[PDB]
């Protein structure tokens, strides 16, 4: 349809970005494009901007979603969209730039504490909280998707995957997602809410725990299938978390839907007692950034 394609050559800025923004660093480079950071001549302010290839995506109509998605649900606990170009085949996106980094890093290179999960765990929520009640499912929630501020803000990105529901459609049905945090429902193609999310969340609360989340070692395909057949995972050392810890995971990752904690009811949920300041997260940061610099 050149009607989506018209769509999003409109939603874009035009004039040059490589002139409107200068210092190109290349910072990551997934499936999804490769990410900078950068300097906006006019403003002085760093920003990311990610770079995804059109081509890669047939379904144009997830791009412009994306955009859409972004403007329309600002939050605090979410990477501010600040703006987008064409720049031939590729899409740029200027974003709010985190200096702090991913939590992925962060789970693979540090071991946090109990009071540390519990605070990266509330912010989260927060965040989740606050689409659910927008009626948006972000559908690709892990670590990769978690970035940090120097202030040990903890904000969530991507909704690439996402889906709106309505009182008319209150049920998805397709089966996206990164499969080693997809929930059950999802894998097994049943209709499906947004405590999918809370699912996800759960098994990133596993890669706080064990670094990785459950199955990572096995291809994509074999993981789905473990998924379907064993649902709820188990961990590797389940006696070296507290009781309440314990109990969050298990509202978190609940095989029927219905008792499966939601956001709001997480949020006031007893392991979120022991949360710290934010400025806990800080020395986490920093042992990140020292283990990673040399790559
Ligand atoms: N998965 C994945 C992709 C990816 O590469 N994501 C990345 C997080 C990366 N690393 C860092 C490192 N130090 C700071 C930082 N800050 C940032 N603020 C704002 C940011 C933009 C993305 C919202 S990214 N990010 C860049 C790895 C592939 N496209 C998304």
Same mark, same amino acid.
Not at 13 to 16: A, N
Not at 19 to 32: D, H, L, V
């Given at each position: 349809?050149?009607?989506? *394609?018209?769509?999003?050559?409109?939603?874009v800025?035009?004039?040059?970005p490589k002139?409107?923004?200068?210092?190109?660093? =290349?910072?990551?480079?997934?499936? &999804?494009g490769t990410?900078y950071?950068? !300097?906006?001549?006019?403003?002085? %302010?760093?920003?990311?901007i990610k770079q995804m290839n059109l081509q890669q995506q047939?379904?144009?109509?997830?791009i412009? #979603?994306?955009?859409?998605?972004?403007?329309?649900?600002?939050?605090?606990?979410?990477?501010?969209?600040?703006?987008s170009y064409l720049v031939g085949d590729e899409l740029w996106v200027? !974003?709010?730039?985190?200096?702090? +980094?991913?939590?992925?890093?962060?789970?693979?290179?540090?071991? !946090?504490?109990?009071?540390?999960?519990?605070? /990266?765990?509330?912010?989260?929520? %927060?965040?989740?909280?606050?689409? $659910?009640?927008?009626?948006?499912? $972000?559908?690709?929630?892990?670590?990769? #998707?978690?970035? *940090?501020?120097?202030? +040990?803000?903890? =904000?969530?990105?991507?909704? +690439?995957?996402?889906?709106?529901?309505?009182?008319?459609?209150?049920?998805?049905?397709?089966?996206? +997602?990164?499969?080693?945090?997809?929930?059950?429902?999802?894998?097994?193609?049943?209709?499906?809410?947004?405590? /999918?999310?809370?699912?996800?969340?759960?098994?990133?609360?596993?890669?706080?725990?064990?670094?990785?989340?459950?199955?990572? #070692?096995?291809?994509?395909?074999?993981?789905?299938?473990?998924?379907?057949?064993?649902?709820?995972?188990?961990?590797? #050392?389940?006696?070296?978390? &507290?009781?309440?810890?314990?109990?969050?995971?298990?509202?978190?990752?609940? !095989?029927?839907?219905?008792?499966?904690?939601?956001?709001?009811?997480?949020?006031? $949920? %007893?392991?979120?007692?022991?949360?710290?300041?934010?400025?806990?997260?800080?020395?986490?940061?920093?042992?990140? =950034?020292?283990?990673?610099?040399?790559?």
């Open positions: 349809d050149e009607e989506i *394609l018209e769509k999003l050559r409109s939603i800025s035009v004039g040059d002139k409107k923004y200068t210092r190109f660093e =290349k910072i990551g480079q997934g499936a &999804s990410v950071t950068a !300097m906006d001549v006019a403003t002085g %302010q760093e920003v990311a047939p379904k144009k109509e997830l412009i #979603n994306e955009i859409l998605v972004m403007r329309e649900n600002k939050n605090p606990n979410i990477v501010n969209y600040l703006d200027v !974003m709010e730039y985190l200096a702090g +980094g991913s939590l992925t890093d962060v789970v693979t290179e540090t071991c !946090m504490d109990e009071g540390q999960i519990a605070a /990266v765990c509330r912010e989260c929520l %927060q965040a989740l909280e606050f689409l $659910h009640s927008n009626q948006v499912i $972000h559908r690709n929630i892990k670590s990769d #998707n978690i970035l *940090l501020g120097m202030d +040990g803000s903890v =904000k969530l990105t991507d909704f +690439g995957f996402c889906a709106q529901i309505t009182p008319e459609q209150s049920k998805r049905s397709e089966m996206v +997602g990164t499969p080693y945090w997809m929930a059950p429902e999802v894998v097994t193609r049943k209709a499906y809410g947004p405590k /999918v999310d809370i699912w996800s969340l759960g098994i990133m609360a596993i890669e706080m725990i064990e670094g990785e989340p459950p199955y990572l #070692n096995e291809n994509p395909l074999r993981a789905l299938y473990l998924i379907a057949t064993n649902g709820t995972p188990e961990l590797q #050392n389940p006696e070296k978390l &507290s009781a309440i810890f314990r109990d969050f995971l298990n509202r978190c990752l609940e !095989m029927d839907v219905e008792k499966r904690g939601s956001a709001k009811e997480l949020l006031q $949920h %007893q392991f979120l007692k022991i949360a710290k300041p934010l400025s806990s997260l800080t020395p986490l940061i920093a042992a990140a =950034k020292e283990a990673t610099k040399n790559n």
